[PDB]
Amino acid sequence: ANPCCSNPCQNRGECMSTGFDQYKCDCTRTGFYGENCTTPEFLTRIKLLLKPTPNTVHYILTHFKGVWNIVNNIPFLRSLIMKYVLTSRSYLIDSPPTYNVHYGYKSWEAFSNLSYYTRALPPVADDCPTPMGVKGNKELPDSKEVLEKVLLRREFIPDPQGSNMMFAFFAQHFTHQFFKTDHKRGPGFTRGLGHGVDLNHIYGETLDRQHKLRLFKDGKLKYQVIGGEVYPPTVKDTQVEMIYPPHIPENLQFAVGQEVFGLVPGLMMYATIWLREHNRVCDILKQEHPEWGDEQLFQTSRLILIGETIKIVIEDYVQHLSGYHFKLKFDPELLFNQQFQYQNRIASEFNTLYHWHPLLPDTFNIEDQEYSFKQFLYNNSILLEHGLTQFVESFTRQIAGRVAGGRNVPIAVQAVAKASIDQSREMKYQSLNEYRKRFSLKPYTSFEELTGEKEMAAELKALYSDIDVMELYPALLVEKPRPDAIFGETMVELGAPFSLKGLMGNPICSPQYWKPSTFGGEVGFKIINTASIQSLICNNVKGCPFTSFNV
Amino acid sequence: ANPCCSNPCQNRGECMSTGFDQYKCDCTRTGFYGENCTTPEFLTRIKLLLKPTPNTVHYILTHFKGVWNIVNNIPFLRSLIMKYVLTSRSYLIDSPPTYNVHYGYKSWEAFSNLSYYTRALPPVADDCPTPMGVKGNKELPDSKEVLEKVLLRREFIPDPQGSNMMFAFFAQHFTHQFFKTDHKRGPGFTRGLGHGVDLNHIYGETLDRQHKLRLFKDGKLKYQVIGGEVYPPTVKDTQVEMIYPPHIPENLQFAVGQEVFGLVPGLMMYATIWLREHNRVCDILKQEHPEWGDEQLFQTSRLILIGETIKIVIEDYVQHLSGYHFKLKFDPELLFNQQFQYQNRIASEFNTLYHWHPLLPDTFNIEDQEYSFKQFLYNNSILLEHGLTQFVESFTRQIAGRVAGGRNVPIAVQAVAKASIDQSREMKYQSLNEYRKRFSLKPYTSFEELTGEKEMAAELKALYSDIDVMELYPALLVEKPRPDAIFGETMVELGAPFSLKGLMGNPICSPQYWKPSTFGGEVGFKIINTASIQSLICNNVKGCPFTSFNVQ
Ligand SMILES: COc1ccc2c(c1)c(CC(=O)NCCCCNC(=O)CCC(=O)O[C@@H]1c3cc4c(cc3[C@H](c3cc(OC)c(OC)c(OC)c3)[C@@H]3C(=O)OC[C@H]31)OCO4)c(C)n2C(=O)c1ccc(Cl)cc1
Ligand SMILES: COc1ccc2c(c1)c(CC(=O)NCCCCNC(=O)CCC(=O)O[C@@H]1c3cc4c(cc3[C@H](c3cc(OC)c(OC)c(OC)c3)[C@@H]3C(=O)OC[C@H]31)OCO4)c(C)n2C(=O)c1ccc(Cl)cc1
Ligand code: HEM
Ligand code: HEM
Ligand SMILES: *[C@@H]1O[C@H](CO)[C@@H](O[C@@H]2O[C@H](CO)[C@@H](O)[C@H](O)[C@H]2NC(C)=O)[C@H](O)[C@H]1NC(C)=O
Ligand SMILES: *[C@@H]1O[C@H](CO)[C@@H](O[C@@H]2O[C@H](CO)[C@@H](O)[C@H](O)[C@H]2NC(C)=O)[C@H](O)[C@H]1NC(C)=O
Ligand SMILES: CCCCCCCCO[C@@H]1O[C@H](CO)[C@@H](O)[C@H](O)[C@H]1O
Ligand SMILES: *[C@@H]1O[C@H](CO)[C@@H](O)[C@H](O)[C@H]1NC(C)=O
Ligand SMILES: *[C@@H]1O[C@H](CO)[C@@H](O)[C@H](O)[C@H]1NC(C)=O
Ligand SMILES: *[C@@H]1O[C@H](CO)[C@@H](O)[C@H](O)[C@H]1NC(C)=O
Ligand SMILES: *[C@@H]1O[C@H](CO)[C@@H](O)[C@H](O)[C@H]1NC(C)=O
C-alpha cells in the first residue's frame, strides 16, 4: 500500500510518498541522482572505480606480516592507518540518529526518546503486502524450521581464530552494558539510556542503585571477603535488585551494576575483576590525592575504568577478532582534526548482530570439571568453589565456537536464537540484502553464494525461495566465513562501524576530556593508556595468571 | 582550603589539587604553558597580535553600511562571512559539556545527568575562604543594596535600538522552552531535558502532555474558537496542568505546552500564534500528502516549526539585537565542511545572562489602555478583549527598555532581580572578571571602566571594594552599553556563543536531517527557508498586520 514498500530508492536516498501510489526519492548528498538515485555523478564514478572491496582489504590486512611489522613500528604511519580505519567508514552511521521501530521517517520523537534502540534502516511499513516489503511470500518461513535446519549445532564447531571463553564472556559482559532490552516495552526498547560505554553494568544505571553499591569511603565499591578473596557484596547488604531464582541462598546473591549478571559465573567473574579494578584505582588516586574526598575518588576512578575498557576493547578485543597483522590503537587525538560526532545511540541491528551464542561450548570446563548448561547457569558456588585464578586459567584454555558458517547454536539456548528471528520480524527488519546495500556491500545473488556451500543453501532456498527475502539474523550465522575466520563479511562490515562509533563517540575521547587532569593527573592517565586484558587480570587476580583472548 | 580556590590557572588551563596545599595546571591544548598556563607558544603570540578586540569588530559590523550592502548581495561572501560568525565562538563552548553546580571537576555524573544546567565555569568550591574564592570579603554585599542602588528603575530608559514589546515577549516566549528551572531541586536544575529548541513550550515536555494537547486528527493541536477566533483549549477540557491563581475563570485557563505561559497575555499571544502556525502547516502538509496519517502530519509539522523558529531567531531576532548592517543567515550547509558537534547542553550562565527584565515597560499599552503589572499578569481576558491583531499592532508600537546601562529594572519585578543575584551566589558563580577571561575578554580594572560613568561606579566600589569581586549578573545590567546599543560587551560576547550553539546544534541542522524529505518535501522545506516574524504574523493573524522587532 505504501508506495515506498519496495524500497525503491538506492544509495541511501530517502523514499517519501507523494500521493497514494507515487513516491519521490530524495537523493541529496548521496552522490547519485535520478529517480531512485542510481545515476552517479562524475566524482562518484571515480570513487567507485578505485574503491577496493571489503574482502580485498581484509586479505591485505591479514597477509604481508613482514610489511605490517614495519608499519607497526612507524608511529606516524601507524597513526595514519589507524586514523584511516576510524574515519574510513564513519559515513556509514547516522549521527544524530534517525529512525526507530515506530518511525520509518525522521521525527522529534524518534530523535529525542532515548528509550528506543535507533535503526540503521527504517522498519518495513505496517501496510506493506509482505514482511520484507513486496518481495517473497505473504509469510516468512517457520522460524523453528529455519533454526533447526541451519542454526542448531550438530557437532561443536570450534572457532578457527582460536577465541576462548575469556573472550566469549568478555564479549557478553561488555556488550550487556548497552544491550539491555526493555522487555515490558518491547524488543525495540532499551534500559541503557546512556547508549554506550558508561560502565553502568558495574556502577548501576541510576544514581540510587549506584549509591547502594558504593562504600562511600575512599571512592570504593562495597565488597565482601570470602576465603580471603574479594567478591561483590550481597543483595542483603546493599538492597540492590538482582535477578535470581528463589532457591539461591542469600550469601550467594551477589549484587553488581547489571541486574542479570548473576545469570552465569562467567559474567560474575568479570564483574568481580572490574570491581577489584575500581577499588585498586581508588587506592592509587588516594595515594596521589590525600586531599580528595570519597565523591571525587569514585568519579575519577569511574572515568579511568571507562578509559581502560575502551583501550582493552580496541587493542585486545577487536584486535583479536580482526585477525589483522596491523596493530590497532586507542588514540582519541587521531580524531581531533577530523569531523566526528562525540555521541552515540545504540542501534537495534547492532544488538541483533551481536547475538554471538554460537560462541558457547557444549560444556563449561573449569579445572577437572565439565559443567553442563544446567549446572552452570545461576550457580555462583562454582565461582567460589574454584576461585578466580582457576577460572581465568581454565577459560583461557577452552576454545569457543565459530559464529558464522552455520549450525553451531547450542540447543541449550535454542529459544534465544528463535527469539532473535521472531523479534527481528516483530521489529519489521528489512532483508539481508537491503542491509548489505545499506552498508555498501554487494547483494547476494543466491543462497549458495551466501553460505559458500550446498546443503544449507538448499534448505534455505526451499524455505525462503528468493535470496532477496533472506533475513539478516540467520544469514549472519550461516554466512560463508572469511578464510579461517570466525565471521563472514556481513558481520564485520555492519558491526565494525557501530563498534568504533560506540567506542570513540564517548565523551572521554573528546578534546576537552582527553587530558591528564580529567583522570586525576598523569598517573590516572597512564592507567588508561597502558591498560590491557593481561594487566587487568594480572593486577586483580591472585597469582597474576597468564591470559589472552585466544587459546 | 582548596589550593584551587584562587583560580590560578589562566587561558582555560585546568586546576587540580596535588596535595593539601599545592596545585597543578593542565595546559593541554590551551596554546599556553608554564605553572598557570600564562606563557604563550609562538603560534599563540602571533594569533594574539593579529586578533581584533570585540569592540573593534562591533564597530566594523555596525558601520560602513554601503560596503555591507555590497557584501549582502554577494552570496559567496555573505556565506563566507556568516560561516565565520558561526565558527568563531564555536570553541568557547564545551561540547560535550563538562561542569555543573555540584561538580567542579569533570565526572560521568556531570556529563550524563540531564537534569542539571551545565556550567561554562566551575563553581567556587565549598571550602573556599570567600564567595569568589580568595579575594574580597567574607561575604558579598547585601543583594538588596546592590539591587536598590544600581538596578532599580528611576525613570524608564528606552532601548536606543528601538526594541518593542513584540521583541520582548518573543524573547520571553522563545527562551522559556529551555530556561525552565526546577525549583523543587534547586536553581542549578532544569526541567527542559531537551536542552534546546525542541518547542516543548508548544508541544509539552512529556509524551503524556503532548497527547492531551493533540487533536489526533490531521496532525493538529486542540484549539477552541471564541468569537470566530482560534485560541488554545482549556485546562478543563484537556486536563493539561497549568499554573493559574485559583480565581481564574475556567474559560480563561488556556492550556499550552509550557505550564507558566498563563503568566502574561504576551506569552499567551505567542502561544496562540504558534498554535495557529502548527495547524496551518498541518493543512499544507495534508494537501501535499493526502495519504499521510495524523501521526506523521503532527511530527512533520513540529520539525517544520522547529526550523521556522531557528530561521526567525537568526534572521530577525538576532539580526535586530546585533544592529549589524551585515544580513545574518540561517543555513545549516555552512557547517557541513566544519568541525561541529550537533548537540547542546543549556548553561546556567546563559540562563542568568538572559534575565532581560529591564525590557519591560512600566505599563502595558494595548489600544487605548495602559495596564499595570497587577492588571496585566495572569489576565487572559485582556487577550480576548482586544484580540491578536490589536495585540500585535500595539506591541509593535510600544518601545522596550534598555537592558545594560544600569537602573532600569522595573520595581514591579524587583524580587525577580534580587533572586537572580541571590541564586547566582547560591550556585557559587565565579566573578565577572573570571567570566570575562573565560570568554577571551580583558578584565575590567575598575568600576568606572565597567559602567563608563561615575555615580553607579562609586556606589559599586563602596559595596564591593574590589573590581575582581564584582558579580556577573549585576555587572551585565550596569555595564557601559555599546554606542546607542541595548547591551554592553560582556552580554554579547558571553551570550552569542551559547545562542548560536543552541540554534545550530539542533539535529535538524545536521546533514542527514537537513533535506526536503525530512520536512515532507519541497513545500515543507520552503516554509522553513522563507520564515520570518512578519510571515508568522501575516499567515496567522487576521488582517496581516505589520509587525517588526523594532518600533517604527
Ligand atoms: C574482520 O574481523 C573483524 C571483526 C570485527 C571488527 C573488525 C574486524 C574491525 C576492524 C575494522 O572495522 N576495520 C576497518 C577496515 C577498513 C575498511 N576499509 C574499506 O573498506 C576501504 C574504504 C576506503 O578506504 O574508502 C573510504 C570510502 C569508501 C566509500 C565511500 C567513501 C569513503 C571515504 C572517502 C571520502 C572521500 O572524500 C569524499 C574520498 O575522497 C577524498 C574518498 O576517496 C579518497 C573516500 C573514506 C575516507 O574518507 O577515507 C577512506 C575512504 O563512499 C563509497 O565507499 C572492527 C572495528 N570490528 C569490530 O569492532 C566489530 C565489532 C562487533 C561486530 Cl558484530 C563487528 C565488528
Ligand atoms: C551586537 O549585539 C549582539 C547581541 C546579541 C547577539 C549578537 C550581537 C550576535 C552576533 C554575534 O555572534 N556576533 C559576534 C561578533 C563577531 C565575532 N567574530 C569575531 O570575534 C572574529 C574573531 C576572528 O576573526 O579571529 C578568530 C580567531 C581568534 C582567536 C583565535 C583564533 C581565531 C581563529 C583563527 C584561526 C586561524 O587559523 C585558521 C587564523 O589564522 C589563519 C586566525 O587568524 C590569525 C584566526 C578564527 C578563524 O579561523 O576565523 C576567525 C578567527 O585564537 C584566539 O583568538 C549574536 C549571535 N547574538 C546573540 O544571539 C545573542 C543572544 C543572546 C545573548 Cl544573551 C547574547 C547574544
Ligand atoms: C553464557 C551463557 C549465555 C546464556 C545462558 C545466554 C542467554 C541469553 C538470553 C536468555 C537472552 C535473552 C533473550 C531474550 O530476552 O529474548 C540473551 C540475550 C542476548 N545475548 Fe546471550 N546468552 C549467553 C551468552 C552470550 C554471549 C557469549 C554473548 C556474546 C555477545 C551473548 C549475547 C547476547 C546479546 C547481545 C543479547 C541481547 C541482550 C538484550 O538485548 O538485552 N550472550 N542471551
Ligand atoms: C512580562 C512580564 C514578566 C514577568 C512578570 C516575569 C517574571 C519572572 C519570574 C517571576 C521569574 C521567576 C524567578 C524565579 O523563579 O526565581 C522569571 C524568570 C525569568 N525571566 Fe522573567 N518575567 C517577565 C518577562 C521576561 C522577559 C521579557 C524576559 C526576556 C528574556 C524574561 C526572562 C526570564 C528568564 C530567562 C527567567 C529564568 C527562568 C527559569 O530559570 O526558569 N522574563 N521572570
Ligand atoms: C518513549 O516512547 C515510548 C513509546 O511510545 C513511550 O512509552 C509509552 O508511553 C505512553 C505515554 O507515556 C504510554 O501510554 C504507553 O503505554 C507507553 N508505551 C510503551 C511501549 O512503553 C515512552 O513514554 C517514551 N519516553 C519518553 C521519555 O517520552
Ligand atoms: C541527577 O542528579 C540529581 C541530584 O543528585 C538526582 O536527584 C537526587 O536523587 C537522589 C536519589 O535518586 C535523591 O535522594 C535526592 O533527593 C535527589 N536530589 C535532588 C536535588 O533532586 C537525580 O536523581 C539525578 N538524575 C539521574 C537520572 O541520575
Ligand atoms: C540438532 C538438530 C537436528 C535437526 C533435526 C531437524 C531436522 C533438521 O534438518 C536437517 O538436518 C540434517 C541433520 O544434519 C541435515 O542433513 C539437513 O540438511 C537438515 O535439513
Ligand atoms: C527505479 O527507477 C526506474 C527508472 O530508472 C524505474 O523503472 C523503477 O520502477 C524504479 N523502482 C523500482 C523499485 O523498480
Ligand atoms: C552448582 O555448582 C556446584 C559446584 O560448585 C555443583 O556441585 C552443583 O551441582 C551445582 N548446582 C546445580 C543445581 O547444578
Ligand atoms: C602563578 O604562577 C606564578 C609563577 O609564574 C606565581 O608567582 C603565582 O603565585 C601563581 N598564581 C597567582 C594567582 O599568583
Ligand atoms: C483583567 O483585564 C480586564 C480587561 O480585559 C480588566 O478589566 C480587569 O480589571 C483585569 N483584572 C484584574 C484583576 O486586574
Swiss-Prot record, chain B:
Cofactor(s) annotated in UniProt: heme b
Positions of the EGF-like domain: 1-38
Group of enzyme by EC: oxidoreductase
Pfam families: An_peroxidase, EGF
SUPFAM superfamilies with a match to the protein in the record: EGF/Laminin, Heme-dependent peroxidases
Location of the active site: 176 (proton acceptor), 354 (for cyclooxygenase activity)
Post-translational events: S-nitrosylation by NOS2 (iNOS) activates enzyme activity. S-nitrosylation may take place on different Cys residues in addition to Cys-509.
Membrane topology: Peripheral membrane protein
Gene Ontology CC terms: cytoplasm; cytosol; endoplasmic reticulum membrane; neuron projection; nuclear inner membrane; nuclear outer membrane
Cofactor note: Binds 1 heme b (iron(II)-protoporphyrin IX) group per subunit.
Modified residues (S-nitrosocysteine): 509
Effect of residue 500 to A/F/P/T: Slightly reduced activity
Entry's Gene Ontology molecular function annotations: dioxygenase activity; enzyme binding; heme binding; metal ion binding; peroxidase activity; prostaglandin-endoperoxide synthase activity; protein homodimerization activity
Regulation affecting activity: Inhibited by the nonsteroidal anti-inflammatory drugs aspirin, naproxen, diclofenac, meclofenamic acid, indomethacin and their analogs.
Localization terms from the record: Microsome membrane; Endoplasmic reticulum membrane; Nucleus inner membrane; Nucleus outer membrane
Catalyzed reactions: (5Z,8Z,11Z,14Z)-eicosatetraenoate + AH2 + 2 O2 = prostaglandin H2 + A + H2O; (5Z,8Z,11Z,14Z)-eicosatetraenoate + 2 O2 = prostaglandin G2; prostaglandin G2 + AH2 = prostaglandin H2 + A + H2O; (5Z,8Z,11Z,14Z,17Z)-eicosapentaenoate + 2 O2 = prostaglandin G3
Record's note on what induces expression: By cytokines and mitogens.
Reported tissue expression: Following colon injury, expressed in the wound bed mesenchyme during the first phase of repair, probably by colonic mesenchymal stem cells (at protein level).
Note: The conversion of arachidonate to prostaglandin H2 is a 2 step reaction: a cyclooxygenase (COX) reaction which converts arachidonate to prostaglandin G2 (PGG2) and a peroxidase reaction in which PGG2 is reduced to prostaglandin H2 (PGH2). The cyclooxygenase reaction occurs in a hydrophobic channel in the core of the enzyme. The peroxidase reaction occurs at a heme-containing active site located near the protein surface. The nonsteroidal anti-inflammatory drugs (NSAIDs) binding site corresponds to the cyclooxygenase active site. Conversion of arachidonate to prostaglandin H2 is mediated by 2 different isozymes: the constitutive PTGS1 and the inducible PTGS2. PTGS1 is expressed constitutively and generally produces prostanoids acutely in response to hormonal stimuli to fine-tune physiological processes requiring instantaneous, continuous regulation (e.g. hemostasis). PTGS2 is inducible and typically produces prostanoids that mediate responses to physiological stresses such as infection and inflammation.
Function of the protein: Dual cyclooxygenase and peroxidase in the biosynthesis pathway of prostanoids, a class of C20 oxylipins mainly derived from arachidonate, with a particular role in the inflammatory response. The cyclooxygenase activity oxygenates arachidonate (AA, C20:4(n-6)) to the hydroperoxy endoperoxide prostaglandin G2 (PGG2), and the peroxidase activity reduces PGG2 to the hydroxy endoperoxide PGH2, the precursor of all 2-series prostaglandins and thromboxanes.
Record-stated family: Belongs to the prostaglandin G/H synthase family.
PANTHER family tied to this protein: PROSTAGLANDIN G/H SYNTHASE, PROSTAGLANDIN G_H SYNTHASE 2
Name of the protein: Prostaglandin G/H synthase 2
Species of origin: Mus musculus
Phylogenetic placement of the source organism: Eukaryota, Metazoa, Chordata, Craniata, Vertebrata
